Amino acid sequence: FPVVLVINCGSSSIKFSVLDVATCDVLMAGIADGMNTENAFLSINGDKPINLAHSNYEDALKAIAFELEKRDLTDSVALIGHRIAHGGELFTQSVIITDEIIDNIRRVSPLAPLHNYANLSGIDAARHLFPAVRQVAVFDTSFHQTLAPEAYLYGLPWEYFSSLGVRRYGFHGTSHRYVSRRAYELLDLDEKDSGLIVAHLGNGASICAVRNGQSVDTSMGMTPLEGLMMGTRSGDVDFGAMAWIAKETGQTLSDLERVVNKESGLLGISGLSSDLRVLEKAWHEGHERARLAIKTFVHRIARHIAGHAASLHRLDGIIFTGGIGENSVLIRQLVIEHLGVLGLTLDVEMNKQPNSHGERIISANPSQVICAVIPTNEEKMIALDAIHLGNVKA
Amino acid sequence: FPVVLVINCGSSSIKFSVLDVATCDVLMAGIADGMNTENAFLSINGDKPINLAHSNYEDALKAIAFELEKRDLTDSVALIGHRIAHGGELFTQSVIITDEIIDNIRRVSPLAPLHNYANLSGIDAARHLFPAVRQVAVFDTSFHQTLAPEAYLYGLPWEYFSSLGVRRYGFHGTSHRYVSRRAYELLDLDEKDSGLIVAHLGNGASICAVRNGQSVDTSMGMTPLEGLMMGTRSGDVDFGAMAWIAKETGQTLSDLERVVNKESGLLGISGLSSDLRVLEKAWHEGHERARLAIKTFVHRIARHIAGHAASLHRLDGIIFTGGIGENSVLIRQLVIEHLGVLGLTLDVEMNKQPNSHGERIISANPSQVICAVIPTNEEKMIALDAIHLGNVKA
Ligand SMILES: Nc1nc2c(ncn2[C@@H]2O[C@H](COP(=O)(O)OP(=O)(O)OP(=O)(O)O)[C@@H](O)[C@H]2O)c(=O)[nH]1
Ligand SMILES: Nc1nc2c(ncn2[C@@H]2O[C@H](COP(=O)(O)OP(=O)(O)OP(=O)(O)O)[C@@H](O)[C@H]2O)c(=O)[nH]1
C-alpha cells in the first residue's frame, strides 16, 4: 500500500501531507512553522506541537521524516510531490525532478525570490532524506502557460518581456487545473467544447478563464500581487497613484511593496482583519469599514469574473473554490447578484449548504450559466501527477 | 448671434474652439503649441501658423484673442468654457467660475500636478482678457462622481483614502457623458432604465459603465495611467512587476513613471509607433510586434468592457467613440469578435462605413446587445453646459 508525500515548503513554514496512492485519501498532515527563527515548531494534524530551536529546512523536514518512521510510513513512501511557486516559461507541466529541473528552477528563481528559494531548500532536504524515492515538481504557474501573448503581455517596452521576462504568469494553477477537471464531471460538459470561470478565493485570490480545457486568462500577474483584492494584498492598483504616494509620504518602492503585500486588502480597508469570518460578523454588528472592505472585495471579483469571460467563446460555468469560495454563503451570494447581467440565478437553499456537502451546484434552473462550488484539493492534484509520473521510465 | 469660447489649456498647448450658441456649430478652432519654450506657435484651423518667442499662457491666449478681434468675434463671446482635468471629490457638475471655484481647483490640484496648474493658468488668462464674460468650469472627473465606494476604493490602507484622497476618479467624463446622452436617442432607450458601456478610444483610452444615466464604473483610476493600454501609456500593470524592475534595472519611481507614461503602450510593444494608422499598415505589411501591440490593445479593451458590464443590471448597448473608436474598422471588429460571449453580432458593411456617417449602429439584428459608433463632441458638451449656466442668476 504505497503512499505519496506532498510538500509545500513556504518561506516561513513547511506544509506537508501523506496521501494513499490507491485512494488519494489523506492519512497524515501537518506543518513546521516559524522557520529559521529561534522558535521553530512541528505540528501534526492538530496533535501535540513539538519544538526545535533555530532549525533550518533540512532538519525540519527530518523531524517530519522521523514521524513517518514512528508510524511505519517511511518504507511506504513511493513518491514525493513538491509545490513550486514559479516555473517561469520553462515549465508547462509537472516533471520528474532531476539535475536539469533543479537548474531550471534556479534559473527562474529571480522571478519569485521569496517563494522559490524555499521550494529549492525543500527539494534538497527531501532529496537528502529520501534518495531512492522518485520526486516530482508541480508548478503554480504551469497551467497558465497556454495564455496567448495578447493575454500575458504588459503594456511595457518590449525589452522588459524579451530580455527580463516581465509578463503575466498567474498562480493557483494547480487549484485552477484541479477544479477545472472536476467541473466537467459535475456539470456534464465536454472538455473540448467548454468555457469555465474558476474563482479561487482564499487569503490569496485569483480568477482563471478555462476555455476548452486550457487556461486562456488569469487575474494574477508576474507576481501574486495583481488582480483581485485579497486578505492583505491590494490587488489591481493604479501605478500613478503608487507613484503619487511615493512623493507625498516620502516612501520607497520597498516600503510600498510591504504595504501593498502585508498591510493592504481586506485588512487595509477595514482596519480590523484580513479574515472574512471576523469581517462578516463585524458587518452584521454594524461595522461600516468592514462592510466596505467586503463590498469592494465582492465588486472586484465580479469585475474580474465578467472580464475573464471575454476570453471565452461561451460561458457554461462559474466555479467557486478556496477557503472563502467554499465556505462563504454571503460572498458567493453577493458576487452572483453582482453578475445578473450575465443571466445568473442563484438557488439560496443550495447556496446555504455548508462545505460538508462538497461538490455542489448552487444555481437555479432558469439561470443562463451554471454556478457551483468545488472544494479544491491541491494535494490530490500533486499526488495524481506524481502517480502518473511513477509509470515513466527515465 | 452670441458665441461660446471653449478652452483646453494643456501642459504643452492650448486647444481652443468657437461655437455658435444657437446651433453649436464650430465657427473657429485652433492650437497654440510649444508652450513656455523658446519656440511657441499659434495655428488656426489649418491656416497660417504664426509664432511667438518664449510665450506664456497669458500672452498665447491674448494672441488667440487678437484673432477673435480680427474676425469681429470678440464682441460676440457671451460665454467661456474651460476644460479642467481634475475636480477631486468637490465637483460633481459644471460650475460658473468664481473665487470659490478657483480656490477649490487649487485645493484638488495636487491630484493632477501637470494637468491642473495649466488649467488654472488658462482661467486667469481668460479672466484677464474677458472680465465681463461669464466663465464655466467643466471637469473631466465630475461624471464619475456617482461611483459607489466599492467601485472607487483601492485595496490600500484606509488612511490613504481618508486623509490623502487616494481613490479612483476616472477621466474622459465629458466625453462619456456626451456620448451617453446621444446613445439614448440613437438606441431609443429610456435613460432611467438603461445599461451602457462607452469605450472612449484615442491616444488616451477609457471605459465607462453608465447605468440608468449615471457612471457606475470607469477604467481609469486616480491618474489617467490605469485601465486600458493606450498610445504611450501602459495601462493596468502589476505593481509587483514594477517593483521587480526597480531593483533589477536600478530605476527610480520617477524613471518608471516616465516609462509607463511616455515610452509604453502601443509604442512600447511595437517599438514603432503610438499611432494606430501606422501600426495597422505595419501589421498588413507583416510586422509581428505591431500585430501583438494591437492584439494586446484589443484584448485589454474586451476585458474591461466585459468587466464594466458587471456593474450594470442589463446590457443594452456598447458604444465606440474617440479618434480610434470612430475611425478604426479593424479594432471595433476585433473587440466585438472578442466579446462573442455576450452575444454580440457585428454587421461588417455597417462597420465598414467611415466616420462621415456619424452616429451609426454597427451591430446586426440577431445581436443580443446593440453596438454603435457615436462621434464624441467634447466642445459641444462644454458649450451646452455653458449655455445652461448662462440662464443662472448669480
Ligand atoms: N465566511 C467564512 N470564511 C471562512 C470560513 N472558513 C475559512 N474562511 C476564510 O478563508 C480564508 C482562508 O482560506 P484559505 O484557502 O485557507 O487561504 P490560504 O490557503 O492561506 O490562501 P491560498 O493558498 O492562496 O488559497 C480566511 O480568510 C477565512 O476568513 C468560513 O467558515 N466562513
Ligand atoms: N485606424 C485609424 N486610426 C485613426 C484614424 N484617425 C485617427 N486615428 C487614431 O486615433 C488616435 C488619435 O485619436 P484622438 O482622439 O485624437 O487622441 P487624443 O485626443 O490625443 O486622446 P484623448 O483626448 O484622450 O481622446 C491616433 O492614435 C490615431 O492612430 C483613422 O482614420 N484610422
mmCIF file of C-alpha atoms and ligand atoms in Angstrom, chain B residues 172 200 202-204 274-277 280 322-324 327-328, ligand 2:
data_model
loop_
_atom_site.group_PDB
_atom_site.id
_atom_site.type_symbol
_atom_site.label_atom_id
_atom_site.label_comp_id
_atom_site.label_asym_id
_atom_site.label_seq_id
_atom_site.Cartn_x
_atom_site.Cartn_y
_atom_site.Cartn_z
ATOM 1 C CA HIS B 172 -12.980 61.331 -20.225
ATOM 2 C CA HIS B 200 -13.667 56.088 -25.439
ATOM 3 C CA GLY B 202 -7.975 57.574 -28.548
ATOM 4 C CA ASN B 203 -4.375 58.361 -27.606
ATOM 5 C CA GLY B 204 -5.856 58.156 -24.126
ATOM 6 C CA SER B 274 1.785 55.023 -30.775
ATOM 7 C CA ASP B 275 -0.335 55.830 -33.835
ATOM 8 C CA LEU B 276 -2.760 53.079 -34.892
ATOM 9 C CA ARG B 277 -2.767 54.056 -38.590
ATOM 10 C CA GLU B 280 -2.452 48.887 -38.837
ATOM 11 C CA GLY B 322 -12.797 58.817 -29.817
ATOM 12 C CA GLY B 323 -10.227 59.021 -32.634
ATOM 13 C CA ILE B 324 -9.745 55.245 -32.621
ATOM 14 C CA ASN B 327 -12.234 55.552 -37.303
ATOM 15 C CA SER B 328 -10.903 52.025 -36.734
HETATM 16 N N1 LIG C 2 -7.299 53.197 -37.833
HETATM 17 C C1 LIG C 2 -7.409 54.521 -37.813
HETATM 18 N N2 LIG C 2 -6.969 55.234 -36.712
HETATM 19 C C2 LIG C 2 -7.076 56.590 -36.682
HETATM 20 C C3 LIG C 2 -7.628 57.279 -37.758
HETATM 21 N N3 LIG C 2 -7.608 58.598 -37.461
HETATM 22 C C4 LIG C 2 -7.063 58.760 -36.233
HETATM 23 N N4 LIG C 2 -6.730 57.524 -35.739
HETATM 24 C C5 LIG C 2 -6.103 57.222 -34.438
HETATM 25 O O1 LIG C 2 -6.658 57.999 -33.396
HETATM 26 C C6 LIG C 2 -5.659 58.357 -32.459
HETATM 27 C C7 LIG C 2 -5.852 59.804 -32.029
HETATM 28 O O2 LIG C 2 -7.170 59.952 -31.549
HETATM 29 P P1 LIG C 2 -7.580 61.184 -30.601
HETATM 30 O O3 LIG C 2 -8.984 61.006 -30.073
HETATM 31 O O4 LIG C 2 -7.441 62.480 -31.368
HETATM 32 O O5 LIG C 2 -6.494 61.121 -29.409
HETATM 33 P P2 LIG C 2 -6.387 62.270 -28.282
HETATM 34 O O6 LIG C 2 -7.430 63.344 -28.496
HETATM 35 O O7 LIG C 2 -4.997 62.861 -28.297
HETATM 36 O O8 LIG C 2 -6.604 61.462 -26.900
HETATM 37 P P3 LIG C 2 -7.874 61.717 -25.934
HETATM 38 O O9 LIG C 2 -8.053 63.196 -25.675
HETATM 39 O O10 LIG C 2 -7.649 61.008 -24.621
HETATM 40 O O11 LIG C 2 -9.106 61.162 -26.612
HETATM 41 C C8 LIG C 2 -4.307 58.137 -33.119
HETATM 42 O O12 LIG C 2 -3.544 57.240 -32.345
HETATM 43 C C9 LIG C 2 -4.617 57.542 -34.480
HETATM 44 O O13 LIG C 2 -3.878 56.367 -34.716
HETATM 45 C C10 LIG C 2 -8.070 56.570 -38.874
HETATM 46 O O14 LIG C 2 -8.562 57.165 -39.833
HETATM 47 N N5 LIG C 2 -7.961 55.189 -38.894
#
